[PDB]
Structure formats: C-alpha cells, structure tokens
Design a protein around this ligand. Sequence first.
Ligand SMILES: Cc1cc2nc3c(=O)[nH]c(=O)nc-3n(C[C@H](O)[C@H](O)[C@H](O)COP(=O)(O)OP(=O)(O)OC[C@H]3O[C@@H](n4cnc5c(N)ncnc54)[C@H](O)[C@@H]3O)c2cc1C
Ligand SMILES: Cc1cc2nc3c(=O)[nH]c(=O)nc-3n(C[C@H](O)[C@H](O)[C@H](O)COP(=O)(O)OP(=O)(O)OC[C@H]3O[C@@H](n4cnc5c(N)ncnc54)[C@H](O)[C@@H]3O)c2cc1C
Ligand SMILES: NC(=O)c1ccc[n+]([C@@H]2O[C@H](COP(=O)([O-])OP(=O)(O)OC[C@H]3O[C@@H](n4cnc5c(N)ncnc54)[C@H](O)[C@@H]3O)[C@@H](O)[C@H]2O)c1
Ligand SMILES: NC(=O)c1ccc[n+]([C@@H]2O[C@H](COP(=O)([O-])OP(=O)(O)OC[C@H]3O[C@@H](n4cnc5c(N)ncnc54)[C@H](O)[C@@H]3O)[C@@H](O)[C@H]2O)c1
Lengths: 463, 463
Amino acid sequence: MKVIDPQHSDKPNVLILGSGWGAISFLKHIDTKKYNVSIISPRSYFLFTPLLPSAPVGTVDEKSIIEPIVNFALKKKGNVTYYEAEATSINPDRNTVTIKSLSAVSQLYQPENHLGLHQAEPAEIKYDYLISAVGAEPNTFGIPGVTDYGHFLKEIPNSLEIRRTFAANLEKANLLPKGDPERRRLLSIVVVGGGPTGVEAAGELQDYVHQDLRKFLPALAEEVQIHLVEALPIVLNMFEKKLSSYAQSHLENTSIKVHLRTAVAKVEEKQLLAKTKHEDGKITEETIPYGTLIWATGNKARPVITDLFKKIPEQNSSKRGLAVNDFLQVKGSNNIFAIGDNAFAGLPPTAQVAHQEAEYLAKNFDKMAQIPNFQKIDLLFEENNFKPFKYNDLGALAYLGSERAIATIRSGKRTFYTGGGLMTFYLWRILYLSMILSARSRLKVFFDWIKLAFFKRDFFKGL
Amino acid sequence: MKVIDPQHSDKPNVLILGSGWGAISFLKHIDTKKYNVSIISPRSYFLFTPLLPSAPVGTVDEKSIIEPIVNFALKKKGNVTYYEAEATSINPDRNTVTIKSLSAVSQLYQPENHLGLHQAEPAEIKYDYLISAVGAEPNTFGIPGVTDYGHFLKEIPNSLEIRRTFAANLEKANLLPKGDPERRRLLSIVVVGGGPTGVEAAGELQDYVHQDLRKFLPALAEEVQIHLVEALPIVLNMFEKKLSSYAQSHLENTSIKVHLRTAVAKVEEKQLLAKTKHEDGKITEETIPYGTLIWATGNKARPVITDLFKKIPEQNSSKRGLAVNDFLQVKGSNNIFAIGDNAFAGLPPTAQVAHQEAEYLAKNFDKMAQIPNFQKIDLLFEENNFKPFKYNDLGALAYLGSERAIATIRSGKRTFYTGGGLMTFYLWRILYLSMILSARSRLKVFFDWIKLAFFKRDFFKGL
Ligand SMILES: Cc1cc2nc3c(=O)[nH]c(=O)nc-3n(C[C@H](O)[C@H](O)[C@H](O)COP(=O)(O)OP(=O)(O)OC[C@H]3O[C@@H](n4cnc5c(N)ncnc54)[C@H](O)[C@@H]3O)c2cc1C
Ligand SMILES: Cc1cc2nc3c(=O)[nH]c(=O)nc-3n(C[C@H](O)[C@H](O)[C@H](O)COP(=O)(O)OP(=O)(O)OC[C@H]3O[C@@H](n4cnc5c(N)ncnc54)[C@H](O)[C@@H]3O)c2cc1C
Ligand SMILES: NC(=O)c1ccc[n+]([C@@H]2O[C@H](COP(=O)([O-])OP(=O)(O)OC[C@H]3O[C@@H](n4cnc5c(N)ncnc54)[C@H](O)[C@@H]3O)[C@@H](O)[C@H]2O)c1
Ligand SMILES: NC(=O)c1ccc[n+]([C@@H]2O[C@H](COP(=O)([O-])OP(=O)(O)OC[C@H]3O[C@@H](n4cnc5c(N)ncnc54)[C@H](O)[C@@H]3O)[C@@H](O)[C@H]2O)c1
C-alpha cells in the first residue's frame, strides 16, 4: 500500500538511489529544468570517502569530510525532493521503489504539496527513470567472527566505532604493568587488507601513535604494534611494482609489521588465525593477537540489488553488480540505469569510475530531453547516435604515513607525475583538496591540516 | 579498602577535585616543583562554558571549546597525576577522597610507579592538601518533570542531546501538514531562564532557524517559535536597566516571545504549566506547548559536598556550598580549600569568580612553600601576614543573537566600555577569544567563526 506519484509537471520523474559519488555527481550535473529529481538515501550527507581513513585518528574531523545533500540540491534551480530512507525493493514492473525507515522528506524549491507520510512508514515511490547508485557493502567472505569482533572502515559511524575501541584499549592497557602480555595485546592493532584504504588506515593510526600518544604516554606508544595483513604478495597492486615496494618499505620503516601473502581464516575475540603462503609454496599457520581489528577488504552487492537480480531475466546470473549497457542501462530494463559500485561494467570499484559514469549519464540525460521519443530505449540510444561510456583512467594516489605518499597521474596513454615521497605527499594533499565536491568541505579540511601543523589531532572517545 | 598514597617525595601531596575553571586555573599557576599534584575528575577535558550555548546549533563545534586536562599538565614541569573518576566521598579525618567509576590514570612526568588499579574499582586517594572545585549541578527546584522531559545546558553531552531533539522534531514536523497543531508544537522551543545562558541559548537557536533552516525549509522556519521564560520581571539582571531593556527589545525583534514574571509550576511531556504575576499583582495561568525544552535556571550543591556538610561541625548548616575563610579554606577543616561554585563566599557563581579565586590560592600556595611550619593552619595564615581574597568584578558580557551583544567592562569603581550592539558583538567575540585557556581552543573557534561567515553551521543529528 501507499504510493507516492507526483506528475502534474510535464517533466519525467527521475529518481536517484543513494547519496554517494554516483548519486551526487549525477545530481551536480542533471538538468532540473528538464527533469523532476527525487533522491532516496538513509544518509543525509555526501561522504568524501578518500579521507575517511583520517577521521578516527583525527587528522581530519568527521564533519570536515561530509556535506549535506540539501546543500547540493539548493544549487539546482528545479524541484528536488529528498527522502531520508533506505530502498528495500526495486519493482521494475510497477516502476516504483519500496522504501523503509523513513526519517524525513525535504522538498526544495517546491512551495506545493504534502505527501501525507509518517515516520518509519513503508511507501512505494514511483519513477519514470531510475538511477541506482547505492554502492556496495563490505565483504567478510564468510570468514567467521569478522562482524562480531571487527570494524569496517566504510561510513562515518565506523570512524567513531574505531576511535572508541582504540581509546578504550589505551585506557585499559595503561593500567596494566609493562610486562603483562594482555597490555601488549590491548595495544595491538590489525588492519586486514593491503588496499589503499588499509594502507592509509594503518598509516594514519601510526602517525597518531608516533606523533601524539608518544607526547604524553611514551611507555604505551612504544608497546603499540600495528599489523597489516594482505592475501596477495604485494601491497597496493594498482600501482607500479617500483611504488608498491617503496610503500611497503616505508610502512616497515614506520614500524608497521606487513604480513604479505597472508589470508585470515578465522577471527576470535582476542586473536585471528592467519595462513601464509611462502615463496616455496608452503602453508604456515600464525596467530596474531589483537585489541583493535579493522576489516578493510573488498566489497559486495547489497541485498536490494541481489533482490533485483531475480526480478529481471537477464540479471538472474549477475553476482558482483547489475550487468549494464555501454550506455550504463541495466540490461533487461527499459528505464533503469546503474552507476558506481552497484553496477557491473568490468571496471574498478572506485570513486573515479563512479564520478565519470555519473557525468556521462547526466549529459546523456539532457541529450534525451531534446528528442520527442523519450517524451524500446535500448535501441533509441544507438539509433539517435551518441557515444557509449568510455572510462578514462586518471591514475592513483595513496598516503603511506609519516608525511609520505605515492602518486601516478595519467590520461589515456601518457603518464605524467611525481610519485616519490614528501613532494608527492603535498601533491596528494593539493589534489585531494581540489577534487572535493564543495567549498565548505574544502575549507574545513584546509583548516584541519593547519591545526594539525600546530596542535596535532583531537582524540575524544565521546565525540 | 584500597588506599593510594605516594610519598617518597619531600613535597606535599596537593589533590584537586574537578577539571573546570577553578581546578584548571589553579593547575595553570600551582608550583609543581614545590608540590605533587593529583587531579580527580570524570571529565578528561576543560570546558569553556561561556560558548557552550553555541555548540548545539553549531556556531562553534563541541571540540572547539574543550581542551584535554593532560595538555595543561604537560606544561607543568613537575609530577601531575590524573585519575579519570568521580569523587564520591570526602573523608577529612582520614585525609582521603573515595573515588568511583575509574576510567583511566595518567601519570605525566613520572617514569615511576604502578598503582595496581583496575577499571571501575573503588579506591581512597590520600592527600596532604585538598582543593575542591567540583562545581555545582543544575537545580530543578523540585519542579516535577524537568529531568524527565527537559535538557540542561551544562556539559557537552547536553549539547548533542539538544541537537538530537530539535533535529528529530524538525524531521517529524515537516512530514505533517502546515495546519496541524502538532506541527506547530513540534517546532516550539522553550528556554527556561532569562540568565545569560538562556538568553544566549535562545538567541543562538534563533540565528540558526533564521539563517540556516530558512535557506532550505522556509515553510518550517516560519512556524518555529522560541519562548524564553523568566521568573523575575527583567532579563539579565546583572546588567544595568538600560541594557536589560535593549536586550529584551532586541530578542523580541528577532521574534522570540519573552515571558517575563513567569514561573514554571510543572512540566508535562508536550507542554508546561506557567504562572505569571502581573503589574497589578494578579496571578494568571498559561499553558505553553513545546517540542524541545531547555532548562537553564540556577544551580545546586552536588551530593559529594552535601555529604561533606554532615562530616564537619561548622558546615552542618551549610546549603548553597562549603562555607569558606577569607583565605578560601573550608571552615572547620585544617587542610581543605574550596573554590568556584561548590564554595560559598557570598560571591556570584561565575567563571570570573572561580578564575580569580584559583589564582589567589595558587599564589598563596607557593607562599606557604617558603615557611617551615607548613612543611593550626587557620592561624598561620593571619600570623604570617598575607592578604585575604578580595574579588574584583570585571563586568559582564552576553550575546543576544542576530550579531548583537551587550557588554560592561570595569575594574573596581571605574566603568569603561561600549555596550551597544554590533560594535559590542565584535568586542564580545574578541574578548571571549582572548580569555580562552589555550591556543588550540582559541584557534579552533577562530576558524569556526570564519567558516560561519561563509557557510553557516553544521547541524548533524548523529555527530
Ligand atoms: C575508506 C575508503 C577510502 C576510499 N578511497 C578512495 C580513493 O582515494 N580514491 C578512489 O578513487 N576511491 C576510493 N574509495 C572507493 C569509493 O569510495 C567508491 O568506489 C565509491 O564510494 C562508489 O560510489 P557509489 O556512489 O557507487 O557508492 P557510495 O559512494 O558508497 O554511495 C552509495 C550511497 O548509497 C547509499 N545507500 C546504501 N544503501 C542504500 C539503500 N538501500 N537505498 C538508498 N541508498 C542507499 C549510501 O548511504 C551512499 O550514500 C574509497 C572507499 C573507502 C571505503
Ligand atoms: C552554559 C553555561 C554558560 C556559562 N557562561 C558563563 C559566562 O559567560 N561567564 C561566567 O562568568 N560564567 C559562566 N558560567 C558559569 C561558570 O561556568 C561557573 O561559575 C564555573 O564553571 C564554576 O567553576 P567550577 O570549577 O566551580 O565548576 P565547573 O567549571 O563547572 O567545573 C566543575 C568540574 O568538576 C567536575 N566534577 C563534577 N563532579 C565531580 C566529582 N564528584 N568529582 C570530581 N570532579 C567532578 C566536572 O566534570 C568539572 O570538571 C556558565 C555556566 C554554564 C552551564
Ligand atoms: N584511482 C584512485 O584515485 C584510487 C586511489 C586509492 C584507492 N582507490 C580504490 O579504492 C578502493 C578501496 O578498496 P580497498 O582499499 O579495500 O582495496 P580492495 O578491497 O580492492 O583490496 C582488498 C585486499 O584485501 C585482500 N584480502 C582479501 N581477503 C583477505 C583475507 N581473508 N585476508 C587477508 N587479506 C585479504 C585482497 O587480496 C585485496 O588485495 C580500491 O578498489 C582502489 O582501487 C582508487
Ligand atoms: N561576568 C561574566 O563574564 C558573565 C557573563 C555571562 C554570565 N555570567 C554568569 O553565568 C551565569 C549564566 O546564567 P546561569 O546559567 O548561571 O543562570 P542564573 O543562575 O544566572 O539565572 C537563572 C534564571 O532563571 C530564573 N528562574 C528560576 N526559576 C525559574 C522558574 N521556575 N521559571 C522561570 N524562570 C526561573 C531566575 O530568576 C534566573 O533569572 C550567571 O550565573 C551569570 O552570573 C557571567
């Protein structure tokens, strides 16, 4: 029951799922004069995921790297509606999306209707076009215990969750005497995943331990040991070999114990079972005790997308995400598009890919606006002659700790960059600032780095 | 059981209760070469209470107006120990203080002992001298419902508690249609107390509603009504009549409904019963519906101080706080001192008073260091010839909203200030910045005000 369906306007109802890179990048460029836009997301803010590994340790504040959805929609002149809720079912036959956990509805540039909704009431939202940018969710690979005893580094609440844990262990351990093995354990951190998230997380945590904790509890700081665990034989594989080594070396120089070729078989409350494959093909078992565990491995399709696989014939055998056209249309659907991590275009799950995908689609959308037939769709795209989506790989950036980073900057075939150390760390800084989506988020981080230069980090367990 | 008592050193063990204005101002000036200092407080940070009314609405961030205790103790060269716990009993006969809810113990500039304490374990902390600066706690006057349905503006968790409430009501109300009286109620705020805390709280809340909420939900913003309730016939009575009127007028011009001569008799979930005395001496009853209620009235002695009243003969009949000498020594005690709100010197309960009291005592303490007899105390003070505490009233400052404030600046008999509007608002700004206790807290707020000038306030219900 309960169906929301506004259509007094002679504009198509475009409906966006998500408030991330895809969803927001799309919103930034969509023509609200030609279309009526509605957004559904449980998160009322955009999250600049690349600096999320700085939040917990407090290099940057959780508020500095987020921006309200409504601040974006305010720059769009036309009608924007934001439902603060989560999409539970996509219904292609009815062209609605069932939502759940409705917190709020904001109607911007709309001095008009009242939907008659109540909080936490279920409702179907009709759409003429659907853009699905709900992102992926963290994958535990069915490795038992991960969720029970570990923390993802994925959203903002995760950042607080980590600080509270580490804070609590610092407090508990410092009461125990130096000898106690429990004290050594509680001061142990284990970051699973040698992908940039994990590398940056391990590095940031270290910077704090070296630069801040040491300033007033050096007896503790010395006993803290940070482990990084990677199943592959190399860290940051998306970079050149030359840089993946320098990263690994530098991490080790900052006192991080890098466990290469090591796969976590199980996670217990106070330790995790690791298997390691060696050069000679032998498998050895290790036990790594831990106080804090950060799980920064790969991601996985959300149940809403899994749900949808079964409802469309030619998605039945999809797994990673929605199989999608060269025009980023969900195969088997006449009016649904998918961008970013919930889509499958055999491209890397990266904000870079989501950003481009979004822009391409938005431009296609105002192109559709000037064609009678859109006012069955599969064919019109090729018929009316506009390009398929071609991804342009711009490169990669990763902070390694101790004011060092690696970089590669390309466009197409040419590669032009500096990927060393201290120089690259500044580049990394600048480049990140620049590719932030808002002046506010930009100014906040600029100030956060200046205060860092003079006073180095806030670590409040209740804030 | 369990008594902590370090005394290998030939220095007296000075023990401080609290991490506020008294406790910290005292710490800033106490001579740690002559004395071994220990602090007990459940709060691990200093709170700049004058800007606490800016936190909830997000003019300033909760982190910008707080500073860790250990940051202060780090500037003190000698031994400082911080117990993160609350004092539950003061024991004059034993010269110990029983503590409870022990979270952590930090020993700074002490490469030495291990106390053998565990978390949430009870323990008595011995002292040679005790300074009690635990402050007061909010007074509901036994008016039923206040705690059940209302929020104090006292500590940092209060600021989050208020934002969450207001945020929740904004979300709920916006779903209801304009007509609905529930919508009007949920958008209703009631700030009890015409003291500067309430005035500033009501004003800040207003600035947000006018300057921010209006930018994206003007239909809501218009329906929000802020009430201010004061039992006396005037607001901000500590100021001259001329200024108390201008304040009241300006508040009314910013659309705040000021209920003068109005005392809250009872608080229900959705409304509160008010009685109002009129010019002609008639009592009329009012019902003020509310969604959010902020209780910013007077304060009250904590149970730890109440507990102590009974243990000392000449404190038996104390009520507001500990009766105290002209040397700020607790009457009836030979080694206990009390400063700030938990003390009673017939002076106003203000950070200004607590700041001076603390300095005076610290200076007295290094004076005691050079006299054999301190290495029974009541007499020595007058005998060894140093001044009693004389309070110097420096004046008063209060922000009124809409970038206006009132000010009075004096020292002794002479009064020299500008107390008008926009001018005074800047003065207010400068003067507050200057009387912050740390460069970090100072820089943070300076940046918070600049970001305000360009982007106006973060209002995140989960942060
Ligand atoms: C810690 C970290 C660091 C990273 N650093 C980098 C980097 O430096 N460079 C880089 O290129 N990439 C980086 N990434 C990857 C990048 O963040 C992702 O590729 C990107 O988020 C994908 O964009 P998206 O819009 O598909 O999903 P997201 O950006 O995650 O957004 C998905 C949105 O969907 C919402 N949502 C979830 N479920 C529902 C539902 N049922 N209904 C409605 N909405 C829903 C979410 O709240 C979210 O707003 C990083 C990722 C992480 C976790
Ligand atoms: C919102 C607000 C705004 C204010 N604005 C102003 C202003 O503009 N100007 C002004 O002059 N005054 C102002 N005040 C008043 C001023 O803050 C107090 O008079 C001053 O804080 C008193 O200092 P204190 O050390 O006595 O107590 P506080 O500064 O309150 O500090 C008390 C300390 O004791 C700790 N504590 C509590 N219980 C225990 C226990 N059992 N054991 C150990 N520690 C304990 C607390 O955590 C805290 O660290 C304001 C107060 C509030 C609430
Ligand atoms: N182009 C850019 O601007 C840019 C920059 C930085 C990062 N990124 C992207 O950000 C994304 C962040 O993802 P990520 O950092 O989690 O990398 P990832 O999730 O792709 O890699 C996770 C790693 O964990 C390892 N792993 C899996 N299971 C394991 C187990 N049981 N035990 C131990 N290790 C295990 C895997 O071998 C893998 O290398 C990446 O996809 C990356 O491409 C993009
Ligand atoms: N010198 C400075 O720099 C400076 C500046 C501002 C404030 N201050 C001090 O800080 C404090 C700020 O205010 P506060 O939080 O202490 O409040 P307060 O204790 O100053 O006053 C509380 C107010 O609430 C009223 N009230 C009491 N019961 C009531 C009821 N049932 N219904 C309605 N109203 C009721 C009282 O009449 C009183 O006006 C003051 O004590 C002030 O002296 C100092």
